[PDB]
Amino acid sequence: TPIQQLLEHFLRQLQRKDPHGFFAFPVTDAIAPGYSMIIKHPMDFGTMKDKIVANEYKSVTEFKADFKLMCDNAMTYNRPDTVYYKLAKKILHAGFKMMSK
């Protein structure tokens, strides 16, 4: 409610840190073999945007937990030497630094 524009801003800034759009939409098993056997709770920026515009986030805490879930799932599935794991680690750190007083 008082946080809706704040979260819209946080999402826009976090997506700017993923210019390639690798976190833009859900990862499917066709794109990533075995993904749904390893990752129990998928997340992506599109799903996060739908939750914002639906007023589904009750707090900044809840929003940060979905961002961290997204990045944690990428670091769990992908090997550390991959662009995907490296971006997830980098944007996790930077994003939380932005969103935390």
Next chain:
Amino acid sequence: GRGKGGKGLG
């Protein structure tokens, strides 16, 4: 086979 289909350079 544990990886993305593409290299993610584009």
